[PDB]
């Protein structure tokens, strides 16, 4: 998406701005654009709440340091922002929820660093332990803002090959070229409005297929900043 030799821009949304480079190479999940839920009897006697106030802006998650041995990271949506800003209290005080996303991933490194990060989105990202029966904890199943680290990235902590994750809206980050990705994600469920707390419609993964390498003496940790922007986010109160 975004890489060297692209006119630097300054995208502003609400009370927030990010200096990101304009690169018309954005990933649009399953060839769809985030829209406003089709008429469903539930929001016919209870119109959907669409806070454009401090909910439609640019949320920046605490950067993550990338070292030679980092195994990967992941975030659950909407869980990640459930605890963040009005996007939290709004998604909580309102039973039902529905929203799409502009997901931006970005590295900062020298032209003497090297590494390859795969960035994909996976609907219904259920995980499994090492086992006897035992469903994963609540702290790793719904990590929130901080996210969680992958333990066995080869099977994606879900008994399924990483080698095949590109069958999903992915985006590569090859320091040697670009240094940032962008993904448009449309709401995906088996019902128009689900529960903003119980269910996580999808998971975001940032895995380093090609480890980070440099010659000692150069910054040993590469930052990986992730900015999130809700698109057409509605909420049903039912009152």
């Amino acid at each position: 998406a975004c890489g060297y030799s692209d006119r630097v821009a300054q995208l502003t949304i609400g009370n927030s701005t990010i200096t990101t480079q304009e690169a018309a190479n954005i990933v649009i999940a399953y060839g769809e654009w985030p829209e406003y839920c089709p008429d469903t009897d539930a929001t016919a006697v209870d119109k959907p709440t669409r806070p454009d106030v401090s909910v439609n802006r640019f949320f920046t998650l605490d950067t993550k340091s990338w070292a030679k041995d980092s195994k990967g990271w992941y975030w659950k949506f909407p869980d990640v922002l459930t605890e963040v800003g009005v996007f939290g209290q709004n998604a909580q005080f309102h039973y039902l929820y529905r929203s799409g996303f502009c997901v931006h991933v970005q590295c900062n490194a020298s032209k003497f660093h090297q590494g390859a990060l795969l960035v994909a989105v996976l609907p219904e990202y259920v995980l499994g332990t090492i086992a006897e029966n035992s469903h994963p904890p609540y702290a790793t199943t719904q990590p929130g803002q901080v996210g969680a680290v992958l333990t066995h990235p080869y099977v994606l902590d879900a008994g399924i090959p990483l080698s095949q994750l590109t069958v999903c809206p992915h985006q590569w980050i090859n320091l040697r070229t670009n240094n940032c990705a962008t993904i448009i994600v449309p709401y995906m469920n088996t019902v128009p409005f689900d529960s903003a707390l119980n269910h996580c419609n999808f998971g975001l993964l940032v895995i380093p297929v090609v480890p980070l390498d440099f010659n000692t003496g150069a910054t040993s940790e590469i930052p990986i900043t992730v900015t999130i922007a809700p698109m057409c986010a509605e909420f049903a109160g039912l009152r």
Binding site: V126, G128, H152, I160, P161, L162, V167
Partner: peptide, 20 residues
């Protein structure tokens, strides 16, 4: 929504746990 194929022996009907 097509997702990655299984590559670890199945261990439970209800979940995707694998012998780590």
């Amino acid at each position: 929504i097509p997702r990655p194929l299984r590559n670890q022996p199945y261990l439970f009907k209800t979940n995707p746990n694998y012998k780590g």
